[PDB]
Amino acid sequence: QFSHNPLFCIDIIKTYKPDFTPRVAFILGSGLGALADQIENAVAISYEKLPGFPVSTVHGHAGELVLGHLQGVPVVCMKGRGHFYEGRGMTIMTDAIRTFKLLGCELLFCTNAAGSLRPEVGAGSLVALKDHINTMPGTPMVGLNDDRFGERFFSLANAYDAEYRALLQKVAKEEGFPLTEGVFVSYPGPNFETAAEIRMMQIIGGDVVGMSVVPEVISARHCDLKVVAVSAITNMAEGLSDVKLSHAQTLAAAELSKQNFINLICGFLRKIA
Amino acid sequence: QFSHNPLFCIDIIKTYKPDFTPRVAFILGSGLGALADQIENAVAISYEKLPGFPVSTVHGHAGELVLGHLQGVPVVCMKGRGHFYEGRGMTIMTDAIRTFKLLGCELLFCTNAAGSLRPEVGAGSLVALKDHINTMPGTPMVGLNDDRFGERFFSLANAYDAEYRALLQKVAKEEGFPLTEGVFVSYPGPNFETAAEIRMMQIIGGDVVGMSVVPEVISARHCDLKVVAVSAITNMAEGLSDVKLSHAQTLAAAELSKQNFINLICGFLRKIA
Amino acid sequence: QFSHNPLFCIDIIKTYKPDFTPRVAFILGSGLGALADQIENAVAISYEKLPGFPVSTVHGHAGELVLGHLQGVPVVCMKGRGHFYEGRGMTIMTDAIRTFKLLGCELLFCTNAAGSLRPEVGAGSLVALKDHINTMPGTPMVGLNDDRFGERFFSLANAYDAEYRALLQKVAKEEGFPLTEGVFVSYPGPNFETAAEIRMMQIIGGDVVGMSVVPEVISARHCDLKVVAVSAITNMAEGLSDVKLSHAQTLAAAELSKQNFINLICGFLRKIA
Amino acid sequence: QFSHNPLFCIDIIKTYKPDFTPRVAFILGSGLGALADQIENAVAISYEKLPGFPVSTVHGHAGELVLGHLQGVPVVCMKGRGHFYEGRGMTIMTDAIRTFKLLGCELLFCTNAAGSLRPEVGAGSLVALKDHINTMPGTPMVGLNDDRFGERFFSLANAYDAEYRALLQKVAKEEGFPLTEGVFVSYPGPNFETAAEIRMMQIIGGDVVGMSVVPEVISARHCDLKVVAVSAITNMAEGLSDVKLSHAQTLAAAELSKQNFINLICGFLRKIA
Amino acid sequence: QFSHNPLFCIDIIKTYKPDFTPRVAFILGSGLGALADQIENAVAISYEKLPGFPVSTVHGHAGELVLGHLQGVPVVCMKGRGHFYEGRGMTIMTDAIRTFKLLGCELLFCTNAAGSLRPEVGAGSLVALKDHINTMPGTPMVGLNDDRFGERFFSLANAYDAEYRALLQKVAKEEGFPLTEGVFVSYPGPNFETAAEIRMMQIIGGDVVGMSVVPEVISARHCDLKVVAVSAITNMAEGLSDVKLSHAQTLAAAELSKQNFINLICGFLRKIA
Amino acid sequence: QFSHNPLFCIDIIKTYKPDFTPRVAFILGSGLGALADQIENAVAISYEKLPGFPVSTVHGHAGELVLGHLQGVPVVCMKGRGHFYEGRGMTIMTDAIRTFKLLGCELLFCTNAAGSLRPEVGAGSLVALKDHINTMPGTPMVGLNDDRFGERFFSLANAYDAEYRALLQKVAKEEGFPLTEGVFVSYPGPNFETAAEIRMMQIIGGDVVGMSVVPEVISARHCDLKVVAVSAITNMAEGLSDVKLSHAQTLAAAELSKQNFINLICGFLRKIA
Numbered sequence A, B, C, D, E, F: 001q002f003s004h005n006p007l008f009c010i011d012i013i014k015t016y017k018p019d020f021t022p023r024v025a026f027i028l029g030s031g032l033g034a035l036a037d038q039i040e041n042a043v044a045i046s047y048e049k050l051p052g053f054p055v056s057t058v059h060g061h062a063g064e065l066v067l068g069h070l071q072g073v074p075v076v077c078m079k080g081r082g083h084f085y086e087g088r089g090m091t092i093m094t095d096a097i098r099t100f101k102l103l104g105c106e107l108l109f110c111t112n113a114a115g116s117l118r119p120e121v122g123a124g125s126l127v128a129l130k131d132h133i134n135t136m137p138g139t140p141m142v143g144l145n146d147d148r149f150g151e152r153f154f155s156l157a158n159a160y161d162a163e164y165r166a167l168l169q170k171v172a173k174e175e176g177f178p179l180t181e182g183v184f185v186s187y188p189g190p191n192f193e194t195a196a197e198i199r200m201m202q203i204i205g206g207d208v209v210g211m212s213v214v215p216e217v218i219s220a221r222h223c224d225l226k227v228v229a230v231s232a233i234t235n236m237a238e239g240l241s242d243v244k245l246s247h248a249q250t251l252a253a254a255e256l257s258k259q260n261f262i263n264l265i266c267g268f269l270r271k272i273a
């Protein structure tokens, strides 16, 4: 027995936003809500009205889904996401993503706040994710497979679409800011990482560290939804600076990168219109 | 309260195969079913009739247990196994293995399809596993210990029996094919690994990567059942070639190694008769 | 809905030990019970009378909580702990630690039996833990946050208090035995580690390996309880010696370090009085 | 934590039937589907698309909700219901009824197939229920109360609305058939009643016996939805005739009363328009 | 595995009320809290601090346990109880009662608000319960038996102690008010009874009807705690008057009988001192 | 998902008793074990080896299934049964009965210890059950229906086979003892009934009262297994005598009727051979 939550969401959404077929699905992490404010003919639906959606329990996370246009592009946007640390397992973002797929989106644009594992890339930088290393226990698709959405086994080759990543490089140039590319390594949380765990992540080949992305992304590849992902660096991972880490410091430093993030997103949309 | 499933299986098996005490227990992974076809006085029992057994949900996996003689050796053979990715936890292959032990087997010969982490060893090769690194969440014996089968704590030293491994080296020589030995690293799945995860596995010391073996093997050591394990390399892990990965590609390339696998198994049996 | 077990324990404890405000909370691992015998005006309360406490299921572990004075310091002492391998998740030691906090302790002195990942440091040595790397699935605080004890997110910076660690260095000198400092890497168990997993732990930066510590420690930092931790090396991790590993050998070699452990603890208490 | 299923249904229904505020909600039992065929501008929504609705598992029961006009009255109609015997407890018909309430219905017109406990009233008769006696274990509102729909405690006085019952008496007259009024006694099922249980029901004051009605009705009174209920007598209860009971006999004899049932319903609608 | 909640409560209670061995345990239903106000040296412990106690969710019910002296008798008093309708099964009042037993009480004095099934006995009357008829599903002791408290099977003969009932008759005379004796019939609720159910209860031999008493009482007999019980008639059961039933009307009419109830309780205490 | 326990039992039983097709299945209640001692070529299988069987937890109940011949009739016999009061719901005897059906039995001969509701029939008497009245919550088949064994709905008409009951009357004559026929009313237990509940049972039409029979019997009718049932009267129900009730008194008085019970069973077998 499988979740029909995405199917119910399709119908619930037709009610608040009829004759609408979004092309891009966004997940706005901590602090990045401000972008949804600019969506054309914005219709907001609380997650409490959408079965399966991540009714927020996190600061920086709203619990709203905003549908409309942005750059004249039919877009759907999650203001707030669900994390493994909340206790509902690795499937927490799975119904939502499947909803994006059934809505007819062709890609997911995942954003998240994160720590840097490279001295070279500091707070304020934006990093395009080109791959990931999962450290959370298990994975989203563990369990009986839902044949309606994808196959039992599936490849993560080119999970972070190389083509949309090239477009992201172009937009960064055109606007005068660096857009490094890195390997994201997920961490369960909710505690931040130890300094030793961070050193282990460097050794293991990671460039960025966070508590999200992996569940959504693996879920997206399962149902054949292309993925894009960019992290807003809010600090240096633990042990890599003199700065004390907290959620308050994470919400605060996500503003140094905010304007660059908004322009990158809007420029990417212009190039795919 | 503990599982009595293996005890029930003993009795169920006496019905279909009386006065039979197998010495070797086989687990035939994806594609390797063909071997069970050559079993002497072959009696097939569907997993649906054996409490605790991995009623298949996977392509390449049958859901049959075949008992009989091979190279004149009383043998029991699993056509199909259970994996962590199916959602029933790390204990999925535990009752079955305990059944092998109560049947009186002295060793488990585990086979599995897998990806190579070494450029040197490509699709078509066979690798004898000499050890493993577990990446799946937790382990099979987590929980109350079943004193009827083994102790609370137990060693994995010489888990992949050095002696039976030497015999495997000799057989390979005697038949004209290389038999590299390697460290197996388990992965939860069902998604295949990312390229970065694969690089992390090289760094960590792994030679082979797959979604099985570890549960069965740790379960076997717990109840003092010696283990043997060989992987049929079906491809290069993610990022190590230009080849796209799928279950269809895994079932397909397990044939390049099939004849060598059959001869290795039959030659090993000959040497222990 | 949250656990009120620590609150119930406060009241249960007033009954057996009135007008008592302990400063240091101890967790005596396998073999180290002998220390609790010297507590002044020792009052023992079985874990069966304290909701949430780790009613033992492990050899070397009692299931007793001893309250009293040591070197004239109001102390509370756990004779036996709970482990992830028991099957009750990563929260197994969380209620107990919160009980220590509500009792008014200012620090946790965690002890545990462990294997060494350094040739240089053998069976009999004592190692002060300066940090850790978690390999167990998930973490203790995963799930809804209990605001009565701490915040949603929290730092592990200086988790193993640098100041109390300097005092430990001093005492060791004042008593004639090396007190190496190391990075502890947790392992789920109950099986011991494979040789390959051990090599992976060296590569990853670990110095000591065990099946406990991490749950208690992360729980302690969550509720702002300072931590101290020392491991009694009972052997070399797997593959690093010719010695066969078992719980019997772990209980046995924890005696070579016992007198040094007792003097270190008593000397540390003397310096904080 | 409470069910939001009715709220989701409101939104799902606006999609298939916009600007529609039904006044009467019908539950068509076994055999009575034929009535829904005459609904004006009939829109059918499968229960699989309505969270909480009784996805059928019973013969005679469809799993469809039909919305439209009948005798020019905005009506909503359940073709098929859920029963306690299905194993989902006494709350099985609760979300559906709450959906009727939020839709803005002012009354529920419950119909069901049933056995007679009075020799006087045989197969083919229709009986208006004036009250009930519950024999099923527990009740629908057992558990935390959902303040959004009604209060903790509530009265069943005039549960089967006396006023709408008087209208039913008039209609029956106006059409040439007797409409006896009776006390309905619920039974868990799925087995039919024993002869002794039936005698016990006579003694206890019952006139009609069945496996439904009570859950729906009590749920309706909780959220202040007026109720009407009529049973189509399909046989004499066990031990009261020579006739063998089965679901096939229940679906068959519900036709002797079908035309009278259709006219009663249509005449009642006419009088409330 | 059994509940140790009563054992924990013993210890928690010693903290708030040391060297105290109560003889009588009271359960004050809806409205009867006022009595607890006159307890000598009254110590109040919220149910949130007593594991297993009925943390209230009902109006008229506090969630406090008051210990002290009344008419100079060491007494323990529940201000508020738990009911089957709350959803935690028939065992809801079991730990509390066992706590009364371990505290050393020799009797339980259960009080409750209720409806009368006899015209003769109206709102304002007090009825001593001499026996009961259970209509709730199952019973409290269903499940594995806790040998520490009582036996597997046990008799309900003289459940409502004849001797303490004679004393109650005496006191009533000594105070000027009728004290009718009756058979109590439990009902699950939370809905009030139908008129037909009430007629069925008369037929079945009941005199009083309510939603409590039975769980507590059966639990008391199991652990050999004598019982007393008196109901404050707040109304006539459904269908027996013109009065509309609600919890507001139940809290209101429990005052007509309040002074008589207080004097009966205080006079009974006087006679057992 | 359904229970395959009966199918597993078939196979387990072939092992201990090959080429055996029993015609009659017995359930020996409390005290009646002695009969199984006389079974020809008796093979005993502990319930712990038969998935789904009532591993005993009750005095008077063994936990053994005995297969063999008796009166030269292929018979299967349960020494001990499962009851609703044990906490595993009304389905506790369902797998066992289905096992009897798959074994090929044509009838179930249910026996049980019980109390009499008729002054006329006292301790020592035997009563053939001709029907029943269920007072336990719900019924065995509640939940999804297992189509492999029977239909969703089914009749209890002639549940206690009139034909086998006539044979029972004949055998009683032929041996010189009365064999009254009565209506059995089930009670949940484990507490014995109150005197008032007993009076209610007389009023309701019952002749015998007990804590078993109903689950087994309804389960038997579901899978079309004919039923026979006889109760050994061990006492008068509560309030009908001066005798104190206990399980010890129930095991004791089941001997006054033992010889008559043995002869009745053996005579019935002779007449169906």
Ligand SMILES: Nc1nc2[nH]cnc2c(=O)[nH]1
Binding pocket: A113, A114, A115, A116, A187, A189, A192, A193, A209, A210, A211, A234, A235, A236, A237, A238, A245, A250
């Ligand atoms: N895990 C993790 N999440 C973050 N979010 C923002 N900064 C960080 C960080 O350093 N680590």
Ligand SMILES: Nc1nc2[nH]cnc2c(=O)[nH]1
Binding pocket: B113, B114, B115, B116, B187, B189, B192, B193, B209, B210, B211, B234, B235, B236, B237, B238, B245, B250
């Ligand atoms: N995890 C995993 N399993 C495999 N099975 C066959 N090839 C592979 C591979 O590359 N990875």
Ligand SMILES: Nc1nc2[nH]cnc2c(=O)[nH]1
Binding pocket: C113, C114, C115, C116, C187, C189, C192, C193, C209, C210, C211, C234, C235, C236, C237, C238, C245, C250
């Ligand atoms: N995990 C683990 N625990 C230990 N406890 C004592 N020695 C060891 C060891 O080598 N490994």
Ligand SMILES: Nc1nc2[nH]cnc2c(=O)[nH]1
Binding pocket: D113, D114, D115, D116, D187, D189, D192, D193, D209, D210, D211, D234, D235, D236, D237, D238, D245, D250
């Ligand atoms: N319970 C019950 N349901 C019915 N449905 C139709 N006839 C009957 C009957 O006699 N009893």
Ligand SMILES: Nc1nc2[nH]cnc2c(=O)[nH]1
Binding pocket: E113, E114, E115, E116, E187, E189, E192, E193, E209, E210, E211, E234, E235, E236, E237, E238, E245, E250
């Ligand atoms: N069940 C029930 N409880 C009550 N409490 C107060 N009055 C009543 C009544 O009439 N019925």
Ligand SMILES: Nc1nc2[nH]cnc2c(=O)[nH]1
Binding pocket: F113, F114, F115, F116, F187, F189, F192, F193, F209, F210, F211, F234, F235, F236, F237, F238, F245, F250
């Ligand atoms: N329920 C019940 N079971 C019994 N078993 C034996 N006697 C009795 C009795 O009186 N009542």
